[PDB]
Write an enzyme that holds these catalytic residues in place. Sequence first.
Site, short mmCIF file in Angstrom:
data_model
loop_
_atom_site.label_atom_id
_atom_site.label_comp_id
_atom_site.label_asym_id
_atom_site.label_seq_id
_atom_site.Cartn_x
_atom_site.Cartn_y
_atom_site.Cartn_z
N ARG A 178 0.92 -0.84 -0.89
CA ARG A 178 -0.09 -0.08 0.18
C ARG A 178 0.75 1.11 0.36
NH1 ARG A 178 -4.33 -2.28 -1.34
NH2 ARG A 178 -2.63 -2.41 -2.70
C1 LIG Z 1 -3.30 3.68 -0.49
C2 LIG Z 1 -5.14 2.73 -0.06
N1 LIG Z 1 -5.82 2.06 0.33
C3 LIG Z 1 -6.98 1.42 0.65
C4 LIG Z 1 -6.57 0.61 -0.78
C5 LIG Z 1 -7.38 -0.28 -1.01
O1 LIG Z 1 -8.34 -1.04 0.20
P1 LIG Z 1 -7.48 -2.45 0.71
O2 LIG Z 1 -5.95 -2.75 0.99
O3 LIG Z 1 -8.85 -2.78 2.21
O4 LIG Z 1 -7.68 -3.91 -0.58
C6 LIG Z 1 -6.14 0.69 -1.72
C7 LIG Z 1 -5.64 0.35 -2.99
O5 LIG Z 1 -4.80 0.67 -3.69
C8 LIG Z 1 -4.68 2.31 -1.56
O6 LIG Z 1 -3.99 2.33 -2.25
#
Ligand SMILES: Cc1ncc(COP(=O)(O)O)c(C=O)c1O
Lengths: 199, 199
Positions: A178
Site C-alpha cells: 500500500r
Molecule cells: C492507500 C490505499 N488504501 C486502501 C486501498 C484499498 O483497500 P484494501 O488494501 O483493504 O484492498 C488501496 C488500494 O490500492 C490503497 O492504495
Amino acid sequence: GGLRRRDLPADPLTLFERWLSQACEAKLADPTAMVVATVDEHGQPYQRIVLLKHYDEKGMVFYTNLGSRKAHQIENNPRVSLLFPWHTLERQVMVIGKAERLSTLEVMKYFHSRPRDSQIGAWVSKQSSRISARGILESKFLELKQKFQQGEVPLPSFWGGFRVSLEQIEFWQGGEHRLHDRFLYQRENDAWKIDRLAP
Amino acid sequence: GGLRRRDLPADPLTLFERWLSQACEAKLADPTAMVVATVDEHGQPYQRIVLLKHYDEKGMVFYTNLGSRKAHQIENNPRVSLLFPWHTLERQVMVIGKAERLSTLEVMKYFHSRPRDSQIGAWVSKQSSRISARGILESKFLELKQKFQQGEVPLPSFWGGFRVSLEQIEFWQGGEHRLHDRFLYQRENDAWKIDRLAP
Ligand SMILES: Cc1ncc(COP(=O)(O)O)c(C=O)c1O
Ligand SMILES: Cc1cc2nc3c(=O)[nH]c(=O)nc-3n(C[C@H](O)[C@H](O)[C@H](O)COP(=O)(O)O)c2cc1C
Ligand SMILES: Cc1cc2nc3c(=O)[nH]c(=O)nc-3n(C[C@H](O)[C@H](O)[C@H](O)COP(=O)(O)O)c2cc1C
Ligand SMILES: Cc1ncc(COP(=O)(O)O)c(C=O)c1O
Ligand SMILES: Cc1ncc(COP(=O)(O)O)c(C=O)c1O
Ligand SMILES: Cc1ncc(COP(=O)(O)O)c(C=O)c1O
C-alpha cells in the site's frame, strides 16, 4: 520498477507525455479519457468523463456543449480537477487548474475535423437538459442530416471548448504494501516545485 | 443494445449491481475503483481514486486515512461525487451524495480483514503529507512489522471510512453519432424520479 525523485523530469508535461504514450502503447481504452470535476453554486462537486484533445504549457483542452451542466458550473466557479484513470497500469495523473474558454477560431478548427455524423450529432443534443424520450434525438439527427446535406455542416454557436491551466499536477504509481509513489508538481511562478506525498 | 427507460429498475441500485457484476464478469481492472471528488475551502475540486467496499440503500462505502486531504476536505464540505470509470464497456456511473464517517465498529470489522502487510502499511503512511523520501515509508514498515510481530496488528486511530449517501445516481451508456443514453435517478423523499438527459 518504482518512481524515484532523482528520475523526474523538471517539467511535469515530459513525464505526462511518457505515461500517455505508454498508455496508448498498452492499448488501454481511451487513453485520453480523463474525469473532469466541477463544483456547483452550493459547493457540490460533479463529475463526468471527457476526452483530452490537446495539451501544452498553457494547459489541457477538451470540447463540450456550452449550455451543459459542466459549462454552467465552470462559469460560476472555474476551478476544476482532471484525473486520468490509468489504474490498469497502476497509475494515476491528477491536475488542478482554472478552465477558460477557447476562441471560436480554435473551436472551428477542431470541430471541422470530427466525423460528419459526429458534427451533426453536436447539433442534435441540448446536453444535460432533461428530454422526454430518445426519439427526440434520433428525429432531429435525421432531419439535420439532410437539411445540411452536409454542405459542410456549420459550427453550432452552442459548441465550444475549455483549456485547463496547470497549477498542480500529481503523479501516482502503484506500490506494494500500500506504499505507493506520489509526487506533486506545484506551479510556483512559472516554475515547478516537487514534493513526494505520503500514499 | 441501447438503454430504454421502459427497461429501468425502480431502484437504481438494481441497475448498478448488474453493471458492477458485468464489469467483474468482463474482467475490467479494479471494477470497484471509483473516482471520488471533494471540494476544498476555496471552492477548488480535488480527485483521487478509491475502492468501493460496500453498498446498500444507505450509500457507498470506502476506507481512507483520517488525516488525509480528502478527509480534511470532507470535514469542511461533505458534498462528494463518485464516478465509476467503466468506459471500456461504454459505461459511466456517477453518484452525488453526502459523506459521513463510519463507526469504529464497522471500521474495525473491515480493517481486520485486510492482508497483514496491508494493515501494517496503514500504520506507515501519514497519507497526503509531504515526506522527504520514500525511505521514511520503508523504514517504518520494517520497524512495525516486527514491533507488532503481528499479535494482531492494531487498528490505527487515524484510519477510518466514509459512507456516501445516494441523493443522485446517473447512468451513462455509449451511443453512436455521439447520441448516448443518460438517465438520472433523483432521490425525492425516499423515492426515485427518473429523467433522461441529453448526451
Ligand atoms: C492507500 C490505499 N488504501 C486502501 C486501498 C484499498 O483497500 P484494501 O488494501 O483493504 O484492498 C488501496 C488500494 O490500492 C490503497 O492504495
Ligand atoms: C470515453 C468518453 C469520452 C467522452 N468525451 C466527452 C467530451 O469530450 N465532451 C463532452 O462534452 N462529453 C463527453 N463525454 C460525455 C460526458 O461524460 C457527459 O455525459 C457530458 O459531457 C455531459 O456532462 P455534464 O452534464 O456534467 O455537463 C464522454 C464520455 C465517455 C464515457
Ligand atoms: C485502483 C486504486 C485504488 C485505491 N483505493 C484507495 C482507497 O480505498 N483508499 C485510499 O485512501 N486511497 C486509495 N487509493 C489511493 C488514492 O487515490 C489517493 O492517492 C490517496 O487516498 C490520497 O488522496 P488524497 O490526498 O486526495 O487524500 C487508490 C488508488 C488506486 C489507483
Ligand atoms: C458528447 C460527446 N462529445 C464529444 C466527444 C469526443 O469528441 P469527438 O467526437 O471529436 O472524438 C464524445 C466522446 O465519447 C462525446 O460522448
Ligand atoms: C442543441 C442545443 N443545445 C443548447 C441550446 C441552448 O442552450 P440553453 O437553452 O441552456 O441556453 C440550444 C438552443 O437552441 C440547442 O439547440
Ligand atoms: C500515519 C499517520 N497519519 C496521520 C497522523 C496524524 O494526522 P495529522 O498530523 O494530520 O493530525 C499520524 C500521527 O502520528 C500518523 O502516524
